[PDB]
GROMACS .gro file of C-alpha atoms in nm:
model
   92
    1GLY     CA    1  27.090  16.201   3.840
    2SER     CA    2  27.091  16.220   3.437
    3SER     CA    3  27.309  16.474   3.290
    4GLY     CA    4  27.396  16.722   3.541
    5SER     CA    5  27.362  17.150   3.506
    6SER     CA    6  27.263  17.363   3.873
    7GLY     CA    7  27.022  17.625   3.766
    8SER     CA    8  26.736  17.646   3.554
    9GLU     CA    9  26.696  17.791   3.244
   10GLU     CA   10  26.688  18.185   3.359
   11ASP     CA   11  26.406  18.171   3.695
   12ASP     CA   12  26.135  18.436   3.606
   13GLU     CA   13  25.913  18.579   3.862
   14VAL     CA   14  25.700  18.388   3.730
   15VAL     CA   15  25.857  18.025   3.810
   16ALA     CA   16  26.008  18.124   4.109
   17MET     CA   17  25.653  18.143   4.195
   18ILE     CA   18  25.531  17.815   4.113
   19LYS     CA   19  25.857  17.585   4.224
   20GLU     CA   20  25.771  17.803   4.584
   21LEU     CA   21  25.385  17.692   4.574
   22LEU     CA   22  25.569  17.321   4.441
   23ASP     CA   23  25.781  17.351   4.655
   24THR     CA   24  25.505  17.476   4.953
   25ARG     CA   25  25.315  17.112   4.992
   26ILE     CA   26  25.332  17.030   4.639
   27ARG     CA   27  25.665  16.855   4.600
   28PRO     CA   28  25.689  16.738   4.964
   29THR     CA   29  25.341  16.676   4.973
   30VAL     CA   30  25.338  16.446   4.685
   31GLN     CA   31  25.580  16.214   4.793
   32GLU     CA   32  25.407  16.181   5.085
   33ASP     CA   33  25.155  16.017   4.910
   34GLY     CA   34  25.358  15.821   4.628
   35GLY     CA   35  25.564  16.052   4.348
   36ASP     CA   36  25.827  16.296   4.313
   37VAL     CA   37  25.648  16.586   4.062
   38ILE     CA   38  25.970  16.763   3.983
   39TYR     CA   39  25.833  17.129   3.753
   40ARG     CA   40  26.040  17.096   3.455
   41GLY     CA   41  25.923  17.357   3.176
   42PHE     CA   42  25.692  17.584   3.170
   43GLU     CA   43  25.511  17.668   2.834
   44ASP     CA   44  25.079  17.780   2.725
   45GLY     CA   45  25.123  17.798   3.135
   46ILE     CA   46  25.177  17.382   3.122
   47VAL     CA   47  25.366  17.321   3.378
   48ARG     CA   48  25.663  17.000   3.257
   49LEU     CA   49  25.632  16.791   3.547
   50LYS     CA   50  25.811  16.467   3.588
   51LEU     CA   51  25.568  16.312   3.832
   52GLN     CA   52  25.484  15.924   3.846
   53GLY     CA   53  25.255  15.773   4.129
   54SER     CA   54  25.114  15.395   4.151
   55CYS     CA   55  24.923  15.364   4.426
   56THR     CA   56  24.626  15.531   4.283
   57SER     CA   57  24.476  15.541   4.595
   58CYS     CA   58  24.136  15.514   4.431
   59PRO     CA   59  24.061  15.745   4.209
   60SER     CA   60  23.789  15.948   4.414
   61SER     CA   61  24.071  16.051   4.607
   62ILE     CA   62  24.287  16.159   4.280
   63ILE     CA   63  24.011  16.334   4.135
   64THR     CA   64  23.966  16.484   4.493
   65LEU     CA   65  24.353  16.563   4.591
   66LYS     CA   66  24.568  16.467   4.207
   67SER     CA   67  24.338  16.735   4.058
   68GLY     CA   68  24.230  16.949   4.321
   69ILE     CA   69  24.632  17.031   4.345
   70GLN     CA   70  24.584  17.131   3.960
   71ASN     CA   71  24.394  17.369   4.039
   72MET     CA   72  24.577  17.485   4.349
   73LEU     CA   73  24.886  17.591   4.103
   74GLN     CA   74  24.630  17.774   3.865
   75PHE     CA   75  24.400  17.925   4.168
   76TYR     CA   76  24.712  18.052   4.301
   77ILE     CA   77  24.950  18.092   3.955
   78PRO     CA   78  24.658  18.238   3.672
   79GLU     CA   79  25.011  18.152   3.494
   80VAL     CA   80  24.985  17.797   3.427
   81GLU     CA   81  24.716  17.647   3.256
   82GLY     CA   82  24.759  17.256   3.309
   83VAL     CA   83  25.016  16.996   3.411
   84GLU     CA   84  25.176  16.697   3.194
   85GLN     CA   85  25.382  16.403   3.316
   86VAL     CA   86  25.707  16.488   3.158
   87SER     CA   87  25.949  16.186   3.092
   88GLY     CA   88  25.714  15.894   3.123
   89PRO     CA   89  25.638  15.510   3.002
   90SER     CA   90  25.520  15.547   2.649
   91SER     CA   91  25.608  15.397   2.291
   92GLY     CA   92  25.325  15.347   2.096
   0.00000   0.00000   0.00000
């Protein structure tokens, strides 16, 4: 709900992969916590994700799971390098 466009910019075997690991227990997992991770765009490894979570539920946990996840991706997919929050609050 914003523009409308079924299908991505020509999905590859690399993406199809990330997507999975993203669908596995990443996207359906975040929600459980508090946020919606949507991988939209992939460059320099940095997978463009539009996630958003308010409930920090302590940092340790975040740096434990939150960060832990970022690792999982790289671990499995040697392609990606980092993560980013595409589309977020930030003016100055």
